[PDB]
Design an enzyme around this catalytic site. Sequence first.
Site, mmCIF file in Angstrom:
data_model
loop_
_atom_site.group_PDB
_atom_site.id
_atom_site.type_symbol
_atom_site.label_atom_id
_atom_site.label_comp_id
_atom_site.label_asym_id
_atom_site.label_seq_id
_atom_site.Cartn_x
_atom_site.Cartn_y
_atom_site.Cartn_z
ATOM 1 N N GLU A 153 26.132 126.882 18.929
ATOM 2 C CA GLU A 153 26.148 125.638 18.180
ATOM 3 C C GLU A 153 26.452 125.849 16.710
ATOM 4 O O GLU A 153 27.195 125.073 16.130
ATOM 5 C CB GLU A 153 24.809 124.919 18.323
ATOM 6 C CG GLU A 153 24.735 123.557 17.722
ATOM 7 C CD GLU A 153 24.165 123.522 16.273
ATOM 8 O OE1 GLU A 153 23.673 124.510 15.800
ATOM 9 O OE2 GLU A 153 24.214 122.493 15.576
ATOM 10 N N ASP A 179 17.198 118.178 19.087
ATOM 11 C CA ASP A 179 17.584 118.983 17.918
ATOM 12 C C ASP A 179 16.654 118.728 16.723
ATOM 13 O O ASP A 179 16.338 117.590 16.398
ATOM 14 C CB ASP A 179 19.022 118.668 17.524
ATOM 15 C CG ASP A 179 19.715 119.778 16.801
ATOM 16 O OD1 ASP A 179 19.167 120.775 16.493
ATOM 17 O OD2 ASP A 179 20.878 119.626 16.497
HETATM 18 C C1 LIG Z 1 27.842 122.033 5.100
HETATM 19 O O1 LIG Z 1 26.559 121.686 5.499
HETATM 20 C C2 LIG Z 1 26.439 120.815 6.583
HETATM 21 C C3 LIG Z 1 25.345 120.007 6.633
HETATM 22 C C4 LIG Z 1 25.173 119.145 7.681
HETATM 23 C C5 LIG Z 1 26.085 119.074 8.689
HETATM 24 S S1 LIG Z 1 25.761 117.922 10.004
HETATM 25 O O2 LIG Z 1 26.765 116.978 10.217
HETATM 26 O O3 LIG Z 1 24.678 117.119 9.645
HETATM 27 N N1 LIG Z 1 25.535 118.666 11.485
HETATM 28 C C6 LIG Z 1 24.831 119.910 11.633
HETATM 29 C C7 LIG Z 1 23.661 119.658 12.544
HETATM 30 C C8 LIG Z 1 22.752 120.836 12.843
HETATM 31 C C9 LIG Z 1 22.650 121.970 12.167
HETATM 32 N N2 LIG Z 1 21.759 122.655 12.778
HETATM 33 C C10 LIG Z 1 21.319 122.011 13.813
HETATM 34 N N3 LIG Z 1 21.934 120.888 13.836
HETATM 35 C C11 LIG Z 1 27.185 119.877 8.649
HETATM 36 C C12 LIG Z 1 27.363 120.746 7.602
HETATM 37 ZN ZN LIG Z 2 20.890 124.446 12.144
#
Ligand SMILES: COc1ccc(S(=O)(=O)NCCc2cnc[nH]2)cc1
Ligand SMILES: [Zn+2]
EC number: 2.3.2.5
Lengths: 323, 323, 323, 323, 323, 323
Positions: free
Chosen positions: F163, F210
Amino acid sequence: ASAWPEEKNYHQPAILNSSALRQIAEGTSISEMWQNDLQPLLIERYPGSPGSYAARQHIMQRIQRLQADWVLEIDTFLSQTPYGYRSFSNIISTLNPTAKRHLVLACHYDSKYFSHWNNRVFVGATDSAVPCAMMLELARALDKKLLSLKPDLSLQLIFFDGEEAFLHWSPQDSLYGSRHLAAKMASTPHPPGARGTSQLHGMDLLVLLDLIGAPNPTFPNFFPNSARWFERLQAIEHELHELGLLKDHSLEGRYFQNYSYGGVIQDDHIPFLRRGVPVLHLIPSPFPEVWHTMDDNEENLDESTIDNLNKILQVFVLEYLHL
Amino acid sequence: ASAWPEEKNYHQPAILNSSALRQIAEGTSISEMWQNDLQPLLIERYPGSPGSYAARQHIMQRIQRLQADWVLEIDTFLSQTPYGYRSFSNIISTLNPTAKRHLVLACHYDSKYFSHWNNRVFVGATDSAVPCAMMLELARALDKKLLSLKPDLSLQLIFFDGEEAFLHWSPQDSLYGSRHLAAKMASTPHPPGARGTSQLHGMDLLVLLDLIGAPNPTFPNFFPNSARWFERLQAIEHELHELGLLKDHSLEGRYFQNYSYGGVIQDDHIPFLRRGVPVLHLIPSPFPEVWHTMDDNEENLDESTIDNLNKILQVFVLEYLHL
Amino acid sequence: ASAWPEEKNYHQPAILNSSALRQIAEGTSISEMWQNDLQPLLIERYPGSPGSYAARQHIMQRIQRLQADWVLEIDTFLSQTPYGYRSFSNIISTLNPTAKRHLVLACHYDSKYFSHWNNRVFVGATDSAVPCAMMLELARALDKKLLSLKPDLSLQLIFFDGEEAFLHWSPQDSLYGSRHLAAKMASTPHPPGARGTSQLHGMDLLVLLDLIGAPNPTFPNFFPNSARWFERLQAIEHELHELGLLKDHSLEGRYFQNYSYGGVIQDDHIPFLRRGVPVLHLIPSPFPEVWHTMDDNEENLDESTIDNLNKILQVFVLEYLHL
Amino acid sequence: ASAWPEEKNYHQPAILNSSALRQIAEGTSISEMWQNDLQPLLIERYPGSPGSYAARQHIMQRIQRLQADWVLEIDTFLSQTPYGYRSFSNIISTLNPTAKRHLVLACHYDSKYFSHWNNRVFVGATDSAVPCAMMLELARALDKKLLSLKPDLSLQLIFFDGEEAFLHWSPQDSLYGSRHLAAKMASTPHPPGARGTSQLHGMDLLVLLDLIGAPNPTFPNFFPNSARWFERLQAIEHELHELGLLKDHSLEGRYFQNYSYGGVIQDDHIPFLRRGVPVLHLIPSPFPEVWHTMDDNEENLDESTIDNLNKILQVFVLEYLHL
Amino acid sequence: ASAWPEEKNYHQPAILNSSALRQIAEGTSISEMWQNDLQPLLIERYPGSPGSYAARQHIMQRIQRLQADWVLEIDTFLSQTPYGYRSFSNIISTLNPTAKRHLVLACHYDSKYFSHWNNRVFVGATDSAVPCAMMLELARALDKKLLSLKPDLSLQLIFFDGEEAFLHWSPQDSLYGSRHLAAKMASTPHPPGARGTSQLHGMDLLVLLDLIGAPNPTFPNFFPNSARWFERLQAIEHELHELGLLKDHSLEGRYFQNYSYGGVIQDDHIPFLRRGVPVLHLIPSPFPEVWHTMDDNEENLDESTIDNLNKILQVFVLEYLHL
Amino acid sequence: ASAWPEEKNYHQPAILNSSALRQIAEGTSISEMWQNDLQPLLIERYPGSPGSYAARQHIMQRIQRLQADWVLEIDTFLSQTPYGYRSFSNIISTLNPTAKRHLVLACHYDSKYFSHWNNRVFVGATDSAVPCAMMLELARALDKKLLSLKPDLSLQLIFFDGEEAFLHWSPQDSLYGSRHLAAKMASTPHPPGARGTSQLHGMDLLVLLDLIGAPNPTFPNFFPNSARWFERLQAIEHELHELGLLKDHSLEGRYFQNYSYGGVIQDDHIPFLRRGVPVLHLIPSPFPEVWHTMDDNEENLDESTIDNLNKILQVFVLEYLHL
Ligand SMILES: COc1ccc(S(=O)(=O)NCCc2cnc[nH]2)cc1
Ligand SMILES: [Zn+2]
Ligand SMILES: COc1ccc(S(=O)(=O)NCCc2cnc[nH]2)cc1
Ligand SMILES: COc1ccc(S(=O)(=O)NCCc2cnc[nH]2)cc1
Ligand SMILES: COc1ccc(S(=O)(=O)NCCc2cnc[nH]2)cc1
Ligand SMILES: COc1ccc(S(=O)(=O)NCCc2cnc[nH]2)cc1
Ligand SMILES: [Zn+2]
Ligand SMILES: [Zn+2]
Ligand SMILES: [Zn+2]
Ligand SMILES: [Zn+2]
Ligand SMILES: [Zn+2]
């Protein structure tokens, strides 16, 4: 990753003496291939059809009676076409699935979709029922020697479904079964537990047969990294004619003329070539005159040309495997 | 889809006895095209200029005068260029718009944009004014025959705008009218009412002329799936030679030299070929000496060569269409 | 381009005194729309069916009867589906086609395809039959005012075909008429003759109705660059409340609750927003209770709520347009 | 834009006479290139490696010793690869960087990665160490005449890094340095201060050298928009022979033969051709016999062929630059 | 690759005592920023314009008089727009270019292209002349402390060109200067000689200021990996008000309310965010009421709100650098 | 196609009564999950690593001990990454693989890669070791009732690998295992023998867990096409409270709150949602405070919150499966 995936770059044949050849030419029978392997395949066999089901059972039944330890897989899958979603099935026949390297031979076993014009039916005798029947006769004729395999190399056959387009040839309406299988093999580690090498790495060379069975064919040498085995072909054709093991064959009408091309063809090798696999593409330039006509049929095959090629192919394979 | 899209693969000429060939040799005149159809086009006519609008009016008012029921459409659209947005207009002329199938002839009617260099102006005599005029003379010499049409097959002509690059030949700066029109036919039901077939399906075959007008051309055969029709073109040249109907001709310098090519050329046919339509590409290789220079003018055209090819193309069309 | 495309950012309403608001409250009737515009639409009308053709005839013949010079076009096209190729028809109704700018109202006129489940049939009362009828009642109540139009701004209506997914909502299986129409306007000069501007430029603002018809809706403000117009919609609800012109209403349950959202919803507006056109998306969040169920029928609509919103939307349009 | 990007269209050479030609033919030395430019580059030199760094030093050093006022730049960048992220460095060597128009000679200076097979190492003698030494030798041999440069047109050299694929050839595993540099020049304005012209626009002709060193090469004329300059190379070859200034050379087996090719090769030129730069591609067909084997080594090179080709290239370059 | 690129994940502020704060609030002068830094920027400064040239010299001249060792770069480049190819220039100001990590502050210095409506001119006082002027005043006010830098961390300013769209906001007609610079920095190794780390790795955090200068603004906390520094902002705003160092500021109208969002905005952070850079985006929800009107001007700024923010920003920066 | 892919649209739960609810609430044990499912998964477990392998063993072992007839598959594949090529393995656990319809529970079982900072290790307690242990505990707690499965509908579990992003989040550096598995199920026919339906079509609802473990979480209702099932989770929470079966729990601070969200999160559900699968996404907003720091460890988890959420999820699952 490791080093064995470069072995194919250094692999050399074991050529046969002139006593040995004789034997091979005596080991194959055009007339039993005609009766037992080909005629059952001359039927309407487009994807989804009842004849598609029938051709598929014929093929496995033929392999199952042989004596060598073949391993059959049916790779079924779904895809979208101009007429909707349809199901498709590739057929795969493997000696020694564990070995790292395999030589591969292939053709397509589907026939193009057509209306019944003039109360007639398309069956694609050159395209490609004959090449199917050639792959089967070879496995019969060499069956005894093939057992020998109980260099980490061996042999595999592939019969693809869905090569032809349903409606209009395009990047999305053609090559269903090979676009599918090449992507699946690129994502499968090989051998098991491997960290960096896939099943595509394991393919030494893919020899692809298509549109065979018409008199007077001429085959180009297509590719620089396969050029050296195309030359082996030319030489096998030559010694054989010099010992008169061929019929109705002149040295001024040879099949394997050393002459180039450049303007590639779309066919089931493109998915694998785009990913680096070496290809020897046994398709003629130009296409039989009946290409995609109701006249591409049994009464227009030349018994002798087919017979000569079974002999050349069988020799090459034995030479490649050192058998 | 349905079953009619197939018919084009079964289609065969109705060839002309030699008597007929005589009538047709004398039934066109090079001197009438030169002054009534060509000279009006030898001007600056890059897209948007005033030449473009004039060229367009001339083409349409020549067609509109003939006895056959031609139906004209103008296909006007806007695209992004390296000079910003501009306006483009394609021309399409159709007999029996509603017939399910059409043989198609086509060329590009714009001229490339250059700055005035030593007070010379670029007119593109070969590229492609002559193809335009050749197309116009055709519809004249056969007007009587074409009239008969009232096998559901008929004729259509296309004059593309915007073939040439404005600044640097690239996917985004070339082939503006053809890219646009091919996507339009791709999305339009045909015939009216239909539920599964399009106008591109109805395209039996596409003949594209380009860079015609200099002497001694040589025309490769480009594509397999159109090669039976390239052969016909070879017959037609030959005999007409025997019958003494060509002029300043040497079977040394025959235009249609069977040899294979590729290929490999970017031109208006690309967006159509991409989507599955057979193509017959009549552009010479090598190009003329004066390509994209100021000498591509009137004084450098060989009258005898165009007279010859008007004869060949006129016959092909009756033969393809059965008149 | 030119300078007129800017005007829409400077544009301001001409707001209505309260007298005017009175006249307009009584100048529409919920009972006449219900039976003359809506009931004919409560049928199965997925694309290609016979309901689709009937729905289409009804819409066009209601518009054609009014005193204002509406100009109708049908935009018919072919696309690939997961059931194979099909035919689609969008509807476009325009006053002052040649005016440079237009305010646009729109909704989708197809219904989603389902199998008959317990002998019930899906009609999409909310989704989107009522938006269609609301649009039709509008053009009636204001016919007299609209007639005046003969600031170069006028009105236009759109009824998209093919909003709903045939099998599984995805980029390739949804939004068929809107994806097609947005690319068509993108490529069409506007106004006629123009050299640098398109029909999409001329789109002052896009109001899309969807899923309207149940009680107690709540309408988020979706997009900043349209928020000044969302505010106007809030004024209109409020006052009309004060003037006692709404019915079964509670400022508790006001429809326009300023709070911000996202967002995040896939609908016909996407292909237009993508290319730079301001949007005012009037779909509720949450969706109705019966969404994509068989109970989305007539008996589950609240007559009072639609009467209310017809009043709000009618005013907005005079206010936006100055009548 | 401006007008100067058209100049390359009308540019014409200044042909040398016979007294001059013997001077040039005596001015180059094959044994000096051999021992001082070529032998130091016969090492493992794949990207990231110490041999990569030695090679870079070697090419820079040798140009630095010369009188003419070459401006050297190392263009170092970063890029994902099948083995992870990596650093690459192109080498660029320019006379009169301000001049608006340059003639460009190019090759690739990396070697393909292989594991050692039976104690042998791949060093890529034809591919492309010889082309690198021909470019260094021409700089020596013409140095005094190059001083004359100070028709605003000068000369430029490019040694690309990362031409070869690490694992298997594809669009994202090959042409690392030339993708990078093309896209940068396209986004860089030239001459300084310009508002609508880039550095790519100033590439008059890109001459790429590849796979050079074997006996009996034959070079096709790949591209119609450079064909007049190919013709100049044939005239040069022919008159040098007739004057008896070439070694072991037959007009029946000549290097530049007027035959075309259909289906092109992927090489460092693609990224510049895709953006409209004119290319003269000096790669032979067929490829050398030793291609991509451990036998592409020093002992399989043909001295006389390389000396002949040096003399032809030097003449071609002076005639371009009216020197 | 190494470990220092994760340091930003563990970096903590050095908070200031209440004596120290006092000093900072006394160290900045709104009225000299108004006169010396802002008023010269309130001019027509669209890309290519004379005022674009003027604004660019002003900026560098202001930085050059300060005492700390700033390093200026002008990054000029070419791109295609709806009106053709145009040239653009980013401005970059760096202390300690060699350091591995830098804190970065930015805004855009171009103003949107508009017609002169009502004989009036657009100058974008909030959008974004003020944020430019805030970045300059900060470098003046902290100049003495900034010299201290002669943790391997320091400070950098970026003023982007071409943020606004020329004609219709789109993925290709917006964000010219930041789409350009982010891709260039991703491909540059940092520090020199690095094998696996680029200049984007070196950006600890990007603080982006846009649309500032109107009374009563409210800023969302946009991002989970920047959330902890948004909180530092809230706290600085608070202690300051508790010591009355702000003017016309109530604790019920705070600028930094802890309240979320989700529905992102398109702005110059998107190129860098898509590549993993942590962003603190100082833009308000909702936009000033004059957004993109001729009334976004000098007489509509609130002296006091601007003055309060200079104080909060200056504190944060000092706290982040431990100065 | 067939009709069964519509069933999920009309499916309704079988609500439990009060005697049942106390049984379920007493049937789960937080201390058994804690010591036997959860603590063994608090290790470094990024892809490729020994901890990755231990974790996989742990999850498989624990399911193997149970009575119900789970069918386990390891789906191992290969994929490019910022550090080169790598091997990944998803874990799939199915009851009644033949049944056409399954309800799916999912989470991710890898941990993000970090270097060790001051002797600390990232172990991802909320992210997502707790969700893994909740899925193992529910299997234990409901085992006897799951036996009843042998409405053709069963249950399925998925632990995704890869993931997290290795370097910086993007479309090609994240969601390795879920991109892979979605695309495969879409190309696999279900039930066996089908000609137009895939395994994706049989996903009734995908429930992804999650970022679970912190005190006071609030979960938004993300998706209108699952909203009726979110409503069921609120009713469940509310009646469990009212019966006094939850610990430390206030109806003023409840977990499932009817507020929406605009601007979604990228997570393992995207690839199935993009192809039309219904999603119930159990991730909270805001994220936990400890997100992606070394403080997301055992001591920062809230026991009572996790026990409460177990009881709600177990009830929800029985009511789906009329058990
Ligand atoms: C660059 O930093 C980011 C922050 C948020 C996102 S995000 O879109 O919110 N998705 C990541 C979700 C997740 C991470 N670990 C477990 N689930 C994606 C990137
Ligand atoms: Zn994470
Ligand atoms: C224009 O549509 C096309 C038609 C043919 C080609 S093609 O390249 O010639 N494909 C031939 C492959 C084949 C057909 N039957 C057996 N093998 C390519 C495109
Ligand atoms: C480098 O840019 C290119 C330039 C030309 C070609 S091309 O393949 O030679 N096509 C030219 C077609 C044409 C020109 N005038 C009339 N017809 C291809 C690429
Ligand atoms: C999983 O597939 C999806 C299903 C729905 C959405 S959606 O965003 O909720 N759009 C639905 C729009 C609509 C439906 N009926 C009338 N209007 C988005 C994705
Ligand atoms: C529909 O066209 C659009 C219009 C606005 C947006 S936007 O997201 O709101 N961009 C705002 C960025 C900005 C403007 N001036 C300074 N900064 C996005 C799209
Ligand atoms: Zn075929
Ligand atoms: Zn041309
Ligand atoms: Zn719907
Ligand atoms: Zn090579
Ligand atoms: Zn702005």
